[PDB]
Subunit: 323 residues, 2 copies
């Protein structure tokens, strides 16, 4: 109607996007960002000046906040641009008939490397990251689940365990890694690499792309044990003050030209097909951004772990603090 409140992660919407939206509709969206689901979640339980109308939970946080009654059903009929999303993303259990989420952006977390510092050939697995040769040199994504997933995998047990013994093992493994961990980053992963601070460590693919386009020889080596895969979906907070307005914005974002427009800039893969077709060849050919099913089947997707999410979060906090 008048204003709109869009809470979203850090590097997803570039300048000019929302302005575009406002020209067409005349609805001015006040933009707010975050670096973590957990941060978004908690802020949605306690703050106004966080964001209200449109938020972006990650996929494994959708059923949790739905059964928690934090998000309302979405009127798909209002989303005339829905047919543009490819169904390989729309038969997911966390939301069977896609009623509380719309696939927004997706991507992966691999290993990142400055090729002008480290020959990427040296790095083949998550396990390498633990080598002493990396004392005080890695950047780790500040995401409890990715961090844990990476040790879990390296162990053999993996990604979305529910068995706290296995998770506990992952924890103890991480303790061994911390000495090598020089920084944590869920804002712009790539930056610590550009500022020389780090050489290798974890990184979001959409990120290494903007650094690479920026000038920093940063390769995304897919780790031998997987490649952390994830999808962020839009959602309306149960008591947004402008639902009909969120629908316009969720729909604006489903227009393939918009999607396409943003994907080329941000790197992060789009779960919209029409757009993906018109993807400039250069960006599409990119195997780090659009990995082949050869790799993604050896990769794992980040899913809901249930009441076991308490355990992950708690050990991660311990992991950061003790250190």
């Amino acid at each position: 109607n008048n204003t709109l409140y869009f809470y979203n992660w850090t590097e997803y919407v570039p300048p000019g996007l929302l302005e575009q939206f406002t020209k067409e509709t005349g609805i001015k969206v006040i933009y707010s960002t975050y670096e973590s689901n957990e941060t978004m979640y908690a802020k949605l339980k306690t703050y106004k000046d966080g964001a209200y109308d449109l938020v972006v939970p990650s996929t494994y946080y959708v059923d949790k906040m739905r059964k928690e009654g934090m998000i309302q059903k979405i009127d798909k009929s209002k989303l005339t641009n829905f047919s543009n999303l490819d169904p390989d993303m729309l038969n997911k259990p966390f939301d069977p008939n896609n009623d509380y989420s719309i696939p927004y952006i997706w991507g992966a977390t691999a290993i990142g490397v400055n090729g002008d510092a480290v020959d990427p050939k040296s790095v083949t697995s998550w396990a390498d990251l633990w080598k002493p040769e990396y004392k005080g040199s890695l950047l780790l994504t500040d995401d409890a689940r990715e961090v844990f997933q990476m040790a879990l995998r390296k162990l053999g047990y993996s990604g979305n365990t529910t068995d706290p013994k296995e998770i506990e093992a992952a924890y103890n493994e991480l303790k061994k890694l911390m000495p090598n961990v020089a920084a944590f980053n869920s804002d712009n992963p790539a930056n610590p690499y550009m500022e020389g601070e780090v050489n290798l460590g974890m990184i979001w693919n959409g990120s290494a792309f903007v650094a690479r386009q920026a000038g920093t020889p940063i390769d995304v080596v897919w780790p031998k044990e997987g490649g952390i895969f994830w999808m962020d979906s839009l959602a309306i907070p149960a008591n947004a003050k402008n639902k009909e307005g969120a629908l316009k914005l969720i729909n604006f974002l489903l227009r393939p030209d918009v999607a396409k427009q943003v994907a080329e800039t941000i790197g992060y893969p789009t779960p919209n097909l029409a757009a993906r077709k018109l993807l400039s060849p250069e960006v599409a050919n990119d195997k780090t951004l659009y990995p082949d099913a050869e790799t993604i089947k050896n990769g794992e997707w980040q899913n809901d772990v249930g009441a076991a999410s308490s355990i992950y979060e708690e050990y991660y906090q311990k992991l950061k603090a003790g250190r």
Copy 2:
């Protein structure tokens, strides 16, 4: 030759600028960034994997690292575009006849408020930041000189004092403010505001521009006591391994269509007069980016403080350490 190693500040080169330089000239340039002259200088006294060919120190560090033999004389004649810069930026004492520096990008630090949360009319002076009404809620820039300048300008004597007496006062006063400091930031001062971590504090004009363009309503109030004005300059390390290629980059950033192209992306005002005339109206007319002569009158450019610099630095570290 084959490669170039450019060390510059965090948000100055937009993705695509150097890859464009390489297209024309064929010179591959490896990008590396930094957040401070102090870091840059530090690095410049030790790192191969720091940055060698083209570097961007501040106006105030040019005589400092000149007389250290850190940077070498630039061949003006090879910079055909030198005539585009304005004669009101190339007259300064620190470099009488621009033999060591080349005006690249300039700008300023002021007060930034999320209009949406804080009533901009409520703020008006660096002194207002000290009001305990703002506990643990201010963003301060990670620069010794700027942080101290805000203070000096508070208590009168200011900016480039070389008299340790006034500098000591500066410090004490900063302690008397530190309990209000939420965060320090010299990567992108706008970010913490976006993330809703702070609603006000000091901010660089280019950041707030890109934030407002992004979607975050961030006002920049020019402070009563003044408003820190600064200018960044390209220079060539006394012993870069590709001096001539660097001459090419300098000359490239000097071409107006390249100066304008970026100046609208990042907001920070260009010193190249040629492009300023081609400046898109909205950006040219933006009061916050090209502070009217009056604001720049009550303002103060950060100048070299000579040997007294050590004091500034040393005591800033301490203050950071204290809290």
